[PDB]
Amino acid sequence: EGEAELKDEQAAEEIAQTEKK
Amino acid sequence: PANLPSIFNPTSADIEQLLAAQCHIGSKNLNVHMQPYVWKTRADGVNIINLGKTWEKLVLAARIIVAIDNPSDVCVISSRPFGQRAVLKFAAHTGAQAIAGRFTPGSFTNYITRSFKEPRLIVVTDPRTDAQAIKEASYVNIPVIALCDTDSPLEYVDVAIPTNNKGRHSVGLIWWMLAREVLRLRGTIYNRETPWDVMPDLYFYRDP
Amino acid sequence: EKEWQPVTKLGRLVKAGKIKSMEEIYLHSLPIKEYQIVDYFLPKLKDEVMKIKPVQKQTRAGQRTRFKAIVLIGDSDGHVGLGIKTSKEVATAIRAAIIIAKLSVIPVRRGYWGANLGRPHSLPVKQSGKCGSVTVRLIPAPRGTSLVASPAVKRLLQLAGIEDAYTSSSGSTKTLENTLKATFAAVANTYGFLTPNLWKETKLIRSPLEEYADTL
Amino acid sequence: MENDRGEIVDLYVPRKCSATGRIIKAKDHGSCQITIAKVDENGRAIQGENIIYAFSGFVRAMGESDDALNRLAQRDGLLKNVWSAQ
Amino acid sequence: RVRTKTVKKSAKVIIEKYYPRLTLDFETNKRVCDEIAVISSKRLRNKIAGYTTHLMKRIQRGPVRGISFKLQEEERERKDQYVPEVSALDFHQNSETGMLDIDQETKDLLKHLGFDSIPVNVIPVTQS
Amino acid sequence: VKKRKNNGRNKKGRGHVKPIRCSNCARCTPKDKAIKRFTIRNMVESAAIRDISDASVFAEYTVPKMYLKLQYCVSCAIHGKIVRVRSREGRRNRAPPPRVRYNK
Amino acid sequence: GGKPRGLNAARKLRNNRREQRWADLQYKKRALGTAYKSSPFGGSSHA
Amino acid sequence: VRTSVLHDALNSINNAEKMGKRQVMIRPSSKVIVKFLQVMQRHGYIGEFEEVDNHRSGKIVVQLNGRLNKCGVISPRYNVRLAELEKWVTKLLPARQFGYVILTTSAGIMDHEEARRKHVAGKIIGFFY
RNA sequence: AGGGGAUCGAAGACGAUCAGAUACCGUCGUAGUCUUAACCAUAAACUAUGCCGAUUAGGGAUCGGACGGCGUUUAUUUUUGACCCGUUCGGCACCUUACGAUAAAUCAAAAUGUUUGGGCUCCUGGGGGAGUAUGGUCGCAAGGCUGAAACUUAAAGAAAUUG
Ligand SMILES: [Zn+2]
């Protein structure tokens, strides 16, 4: 459930970068 | 003799001390890898080590030590009481650190312990009782030199000197001869013929 | 942040610029214990986190949750490595994982398929490795085809510099941690295979540690 | 070593074990080098001249390094009548 | 009534730094500690003084492991140069005759090496 | 899983062995599986020896011994505390326990 | 392990595969034609 | 019982090499074994070998020098055309540049590369690289 | 089907316990337990590990045969027998180790397998229905061997870790 800090992480690159509406 | 002259013969004086200290007496148990360093087995008794072959390995071990750039990179280990004093005296005459008694495992692997060392060579009195020292040497690429009896593990032991390894006098005498050879290859003794002024009994053990 | 203080003898020599390149360390097989050594010789090393998965543990009051992270790095020119570390905090684990990855960087050997015309593109031979019920096999391929593999192992081969290859998998490959560790072991063994072109005798030279004198 | 137009393309050329000939891989901890000094006519140790050997971790674990060194040292004329084949 | 590590650890360093300055008397040892140490409690000072005066009572009869002070070391390395006048290995002075005793098959080894002139006595060995 | 390498039986090299009767519940178990204890004791307990000694008519006398061999099934062995459960690593140790020879 | 491996043992290998092929469930329902017999649809798509 | 002396010789060599020895002994000796060793010897994979002659079958003592990875035998000696010879080198050879597949033909036993030059085919018996 | 029938004891009859006790506990007790002449052919019939052949590591015990040796013991005594030391062939097993193998427990084989081929026979393909229905065959009977389908389901199961 580690999805809290992905909004303003900028310290790693995820696979499927979640596009925002 | 492509790389050694004839002046390295044992001579009558050096041999005379060896068999007077019972350095030619082994244990009943015989390892398969120690078969070459066996002259004959006594009828109804123990094996007998070949003292003639002992000198060549002793000289070879000394020649490896001299190759080290600074003497502080050589480390000498002992745990049993019979070898505590001889190790410390060996460290004082030449240049070397000495570790006597408990080894404090993690010395060669952990970099935050107080007794952290980075040696280039290790000399061990007894492979069986100093297994922890040998085990950590296999992690960081250091060759091992050890004194061995008729029965002894030889894992990670590149150079083996056949000796009693358990006598009171035998352990001290071998460490004394090794120190003398190291100084001989350097300019300290200045000559093979001249005698050394330190007495063999200094490298012994005292009860109190 | 500020300048680092070397702790090992090797670290001091690196700081003084007494060794040429990282392959000098590789030739003599010396252990590395300081991550400031790797990034001094190999800049522009890319990092990319694979996934994070929780792990539980039962206690009297309840269940204790920790987070495990898997990170692999590489330069796309013959160097690659990965590290795994778990901790009580998600952010803390990622930072520690990157450090472990840097310590394990290894070189790869790249060969030709058929005739050689410069810039080797594929594996020299076929190699395989096993890590706990997962086996991965790699086969050299002709120039022109891309990498044929699952998305998990395609990323690792991309960062190792290998361009063309064939892949085969066996066992329970759904265990992602086991799959990556098996691929990493197969590539590491490329230099362990004795091809006939390596039969030529080499000259032994003294290690840098022995012939240099360190500072106080 | 590999070539394309006569120039080396290998990243580096690894070394070989002296006892068995296997390639000593990187990260193979437990592999050591043995350097033996060279003596002059009067017994002093010559500086800068030495003989180098390399042993892989595999032979050390088996416990055969002692016999391997004896055979190699005797071959290079360093020892007398200490190693032989039965 | 068991003393914790803080009292015991502090007592060890005091003894080795200032060995002669304090004696077997508990009353005098109480006044030495507070002068050469920073203690914020009288009760803590009393306990420190109680342990250190107990330690020197057992020091008076034989040394104890874990304690080292300057007077003790210097005496130790004075004793370590002890050396006899006649060597134990040397046997010419020892024994009723200079020549020593060996067994039969050792002499055969000596013959192989060429040192026949060594004066030895050979005795057969067998039990069966 | 095998809990013991020898199956807790000590029977290899043969097919059958005749059973015996338990000394407590009269159960049938193979002879090699039972726990056997050999005991040597006196006819009378040590406090009573003096009363017998001075009441004899043969000057000095030596009371005879009695020899018994009790043997139990495993169910009756660990309920009477003849033997007890050991740890996983301590199971593979068949040396007899060192009897106290000083008794404080 | 345990298969016949000789150069003239093509009869045993062919016979063995035919017999053990019935242990499969997908193939067994195809060979017996249960759909043509038991299914409410006569092996068709709609009805 | 002994049904393939060639497999016994090749298996015994492989075990000794993997454990690091330098010499091997082979108890039964035959013409096919000797002709197989000669092909390996001419490529430098082994050194001299000598066949002591007892009156039953003789023995062989081979000298190893490393350089050898594996040597195996195919037990059913299939029949291979000249056109399908490229299928086998893809199967049981680590790479295209090196490695040899041993065949038996009416012109003696030979490796897979000279047979292409002479345009001959036959039966497959083993491999080594 | 005959002979035999001491002891134990399926079935059965009583005494206690218990809310109940057609059981566990106690006193009796038939078939059986033994043997001769014929049937039956199943067991956790287990090392849950098929048979022949090759190679791979150290050790000390033990049973049978042969060979070598210093002594002790002993006899109408020597040679033989008993004890001691060493080598070797064939067995029931064990300890340490891992270069190796496995998911692991663990293994001198369960190793020489993604770098896959020494020879041969039998058996298994998610869990239930089911070793059931039916046909055939053997048996005095009890039963043995061979052996389905309709229908139903997203999990059963193995080794280890923390509570
Ligand atoms: Zn019982």
Residue numbers in the entry:
A (entry chain B): 127 to 147
B (entry chain SA): 3 to 210
C (entry chain SC): 40 to 255
D (entry chain SV): 1 to 86
E (entry chain SR): 3 to 130
F (entry chain Sa): 2 to 105
G (entry chain SX): 3 to 49
H (entry chain SW): 2 to 130
Please share excerpts from the published article on this structure.
While this crucial step in protein maturation is executed by two types of methionine aminopeptidases in eukaryotes (MAP1 and MAP2), additional roles in disease and translational regulation have drawn more attention to MAP2. While MAP1 and MAP2 share the common pita-bread fold, the latter is additionally characterized by the presence of several insertions and a charged N-terminal extension, which consists of segmented regions of alternating poly-acidic and poly-basic stretches. However, the major determinant for binding to the tunnel exit is the MAP2-specific insert domain of ~60 residues, which is locked in between uL23, the universal binding site for nascent chain associated factors, eL19, and 28S rRNA helices H53 and H59 (also termed ES24L). Taken together, our data show that it is the insert domain that specifically directs MAP2 to the site of action on the 80S ribosome, either the PTE or the A-site.
To further examine the role of ES27L in MAP2 binding, a cryo-EM structure of the corresponding CtMAP2(∆N1-73; referred to as ∆N) construct bound to the ribosome was determined, following the same workflow as applied for the full-length protein. However, after separation of the particles according to their translocation states by heterogeneous refinement, we discovered a second binding site for CtMAP2∆N. While in the rotated ribosomal state, the A-site was found occupied by the translocation factor eEF2, in the non-rotated state CtMAP2∆N had entered this position. Unlike the highly adaptive and dynamic binding mode of MAP2 at the PTE, CtMAP2∆N is strongly stabilized at the A-site, resulting in a local resolution of ~3.4 Å. Towards the 60S subunit, two exposed tyrosines (Tyr108 and Tyr117) located in the N-terminal helices of CtMAP2∆N contact the closing loops of helices H89 and H95 of 28S rRNA. The most prominent protein-protein contact of CtMAP2∆N formed in the A-site occurs with 40S protein eS12, while additional electrostatic interactions are present via positively charged residues of the MAP2 core and the 18S rRNA. Notably, the conserved Arg361 that plays a major role in tunnel exit binding, now penetrates deepest into the A-site and interacts with the decoding center of the ribosome by stacking on two conserved adenines (A1752, A2219). In contrast, adenine A2219 within the 28S rRNA is conformationally remodeled and solvent exposed only upon MAP2 binding. Towards the 40S subunit, mostly polar and charged interactions are formed by the rim of the concave side of CtMAP2∆N to protein eS30 and the extended N-terminus of eS23, which becomes ordered in between the decoding center and the MAP2 insert domain. In contrast to the highly dynamic binding mode observed at the PTE, A-site binding is tight, resulting in well-defined densities and with contacts formed to essential sites, i.e. the decoding center and the sarcin ricin loop.
